Amino acid sequence: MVRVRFAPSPTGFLHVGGARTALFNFLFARKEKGKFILRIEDTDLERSEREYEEKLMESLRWLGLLWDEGPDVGGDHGPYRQSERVEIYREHAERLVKEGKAYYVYAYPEEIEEMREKLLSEGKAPHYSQEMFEKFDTPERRREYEEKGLRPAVFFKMPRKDYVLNDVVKGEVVFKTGAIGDFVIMRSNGLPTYNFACVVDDMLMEITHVIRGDDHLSNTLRQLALYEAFEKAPPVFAHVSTILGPDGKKLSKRHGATSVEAFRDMGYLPEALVNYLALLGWSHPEGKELLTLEELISSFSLDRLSPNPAIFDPQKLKWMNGYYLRNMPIEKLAELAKPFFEKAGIKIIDEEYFKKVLEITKERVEVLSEFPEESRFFFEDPAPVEIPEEMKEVFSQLKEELQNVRWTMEEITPVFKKVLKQHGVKPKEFYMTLRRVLTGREEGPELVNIIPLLGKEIFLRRIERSLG
Ligand SMILES: [Cl-]
Ligand SMILES: [Cl-]
């Protein structure tokens, strides 16, 4: 009853816009209990470049946007790669030509681009017609195409009529007669164009709803004409928001990390990204932003898709990441954090100690790559700081006092108070110097939490090492 698809052209990196579009299809499919199809637009890719498809699928599974039908999982409406469907598109292109709805063209791609510019220089519209290509239909050119392994490109006769798109998000989009001209549906190298392959697959795969970025709205005119050519009712269209950077301009390189792979490498969580990606072109009825994946599926709907653009907020994504990172189960937070420590040179053998070190320091990190430098003092002894003159005697006495004591603040704190009062040393300056002895920094977690986690041996060793 309900069938949606994500149709990416794999480049190796799944960007935020793609990830967002795949999420909206996933949520809709899950809510309505329909199917979510993955279609790889690998027409121009080589056999060697299948690793881009492997990386895009990996990133979708990392985000948890699992699909029902696809190149690996299979399905009754396959194959799911456009490279493997070349004969299906050819079969459909020739059918339009036989019905007088399309036609063959023998002009090169280096040419056409010449007459494109000739029409523009002459003030005319850049709209193609069948009579414009008759110049190139000569026996010499047909021989040159045969001898060079080329086929004539198939062009679609664009009819002189109005097309009305009743979009779910954008509403009524009138494409007035004489907007565009004739266009290429099959190229001279035997491969299809995006629009033609898109329509043939949307029909054959029985797509009910096409949810995609609004940058494909112009292309919908070319697709609606093709649906009419094949005499098949088109699917429901939902054109989602354009993702802009924080300054208003289109999201890009200059705005920071743009790929799902880049966020994973920096240390972002899938639940954080998915929740944030959900907010780029949709809102919860009551404006709720911290939603679980179950909450998104339940609350999501096509009537709440914004017709306006989504502005990317890196601070909000990073803050939202910190939220999930702190409320995540410690068992899971440990396995996700461990590689960042190993990459940073800190080796982790004690699993119980590691969970305790992360439980304290998690309140100070928003991203997983921040953990190693923040929690470094808990593993490696810091640089020895010069203990001031009046306290040298106080710090040296602590080795003796704290030797026969249970290693807990309830027993350690009264010993500090006794020695400080006895010597006539103010506590503010003692606790400041003690931080520098144990941590080697001006700030960090509460000293009450740091001291007990480190051993008695680790506490005393750092005092004597700092000055002696
Ligand atoms: Cl698409
Ligand atoms: Cl061509």
Ligand SMILES: [Cl-]
């Ligand atoms: Cl302090």
